[PDB]
Structures are given as structure tokens and as C-alpha cells.
């Protein structure tokens, strides 16, 4: 369970994207390590927006469309469906360092295989190199509760709970990113 002050949401501070339900990296199995996010969830060929590091750590550019940020704690975040990568192998970064954009074309979006409904960021939580459950993890003030099936987005089961305001935040609503929590 990552320190509640370690991570922010993987887009620019002061801006709001729409997340979808928690799922496994593959979208099928267990654990529910990932969630997707897109400003507007549009068609291909649409405008796309900036993905930033959720935390401090080391960059690995695995391919033109995939990036990992690895903290000395072991805690790590994965970023897939990337494009226009503007960081390098071995580059140390902080939360809110622009890594690039999410892809606006399916070709780049799936450089390492898979499927996709349209432009979005697939964003995963790791520890010591393995995917781990998003259950109870904090991203800024938000604590995430994981739903009952892959991509479950029922706001009763899947939600971002703001621990500073007492507010519950649903899938497919704008989620404001205030930055790292204290």
C-alpha cells in the first residue's frame, strides 16, 4: 500500500481527466492494477493531452509507446498507449514531469500489441517489477476503491474518495488533480 504522499494522478496538476474502471494490465485477470484516463475519450485522429509522472523516480523508455517510472522504494508506475516520448532511459523525474502524450492514432497506441477503443492512457501500479492491486492506493487526496470485475465502473463499487473533502468521485467524470498530498 503506497505512501499516501508519494503519488499524484498521471496528468498535469491543475487539470482534469476522466478515468475508467480498474482492471488488470491485460484487462482480463487479477489483480486490478490499472485504470485508464482521457480528457474527453474521443475518436482516433483527435487532439491528445499530456501524461506526467505520477511520482519521483527513474524512467525506462521501453518503446515509442510505453514508459515506466521506478521509485527507489520499488513502487513503480507503468504508462502504456504513449506517444511523443520526451524522456530518456535513466532520466530521474519528479511527480508532474511531462513524459509525453497519450496516442491519437491506434498504430502508435498499440506499438506493443493489445487492443483499444480510442485515445486514452493505460496506467498501472507496480512494486519491485510486478503489477499490484490499486485497492486503497492514494493519488493526491484520492483513495481508490477497486470494483468487482475488470472495468467495473459502478460508482457504488469503483470510486476515487477524496480524503480531504469527503467527496466521492465516479468513473467518467472530470477528476481534478491538485498534486501530491501531504
Among 55, 68, 71, 122, binds Zn ion (CB under 5 A): 122
- 71 among known catalytic residues: no
- Output the CA torsion 144→172→126→137 (10° steps): -10
Give one DSSP letter per residue of 100-135, joined into a string: EEE-SSHHHHTTTS---SSS-EEEEEEETTEE---T
Q: Which is nearer to Zn ion, 27 or 74 (CB)?
A: 27
Q: Of these residues, 55, 71, 120, 169, which one is catalytic?
A: 120
First to last CA, the chain: 16
**Smallest separation (angstroms) from Zn ion to the CB of 139:** 16
CA 141 to chain centre: 15
Q: Closest-CB residue for Zn ion? A: 122
Q: Which is nearer to Zn ion, 84 or 116 (CB)?
A: 116
Residue list 41-70, contact with Zn ion (CB under 5 A): none
- Which residues are annotated binding-site positions for Zn(2+)? 23, 36, 122
Residues lying near Zn ion in the complex (CB under 5 A) are found at 34, 36, 122
Catalytic residues: 81, 120
Amino acid at each position: 500500500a503506497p505512501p499516501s504522499n508519494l503519488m499524484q494522478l498521471p496528468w498535469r496538476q491543475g487539470y482534469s481527466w476522466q478515468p475508467n474502471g480498474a482492471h488488470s494490465n491485460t484487462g482480463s485477470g487479477y489483480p486490478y492494477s490499472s485504470f485508464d484516463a482521457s480528457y474527453d475519450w474521443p475518436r482516433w485522429g483527435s487532439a491528445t493531452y499530456s501524461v506526467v509522472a505520477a511520482h519521483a523516480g527513474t524512467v525506462r523508455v521501453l518503446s515509442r509507446c510505453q514508459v515506466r517510472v521506478t521509485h527507489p522504494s520499488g513502487w513503480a508506475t507503468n504508462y502504456y498507449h504513449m506517444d511523443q516520448i520526451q524522456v530518456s532511459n535513466g532520466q530521474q523525474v519528479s511527480a508532474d514531469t511531462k513524459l509525453g502524450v497519450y496516442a491519437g492514432n491506434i498504430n502508435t497506441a498499440l506499438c506493443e500489441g493489445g487492443s483499444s477503443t480510442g485515445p486514452h492512457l493505460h496506467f498501472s501500479l507496480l512494486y519491485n517489477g510486478a503489477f499490484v492491486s490499486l485497492q486503497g492506493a492514494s493519488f493526491g487526496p484520492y483513495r481508490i476503491n477497486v470494483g468487482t470485475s475488470n472495468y467495473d465502473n459502478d460508482c457504488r463499487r469503483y470510486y476515487f474518495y477524496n480524503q480531504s473533502a469527503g467527496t466521492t468521485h465516479c468513473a467518467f467524470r472530470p477528476l481534478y488533480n491538485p498534486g501530491l498530498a501531504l
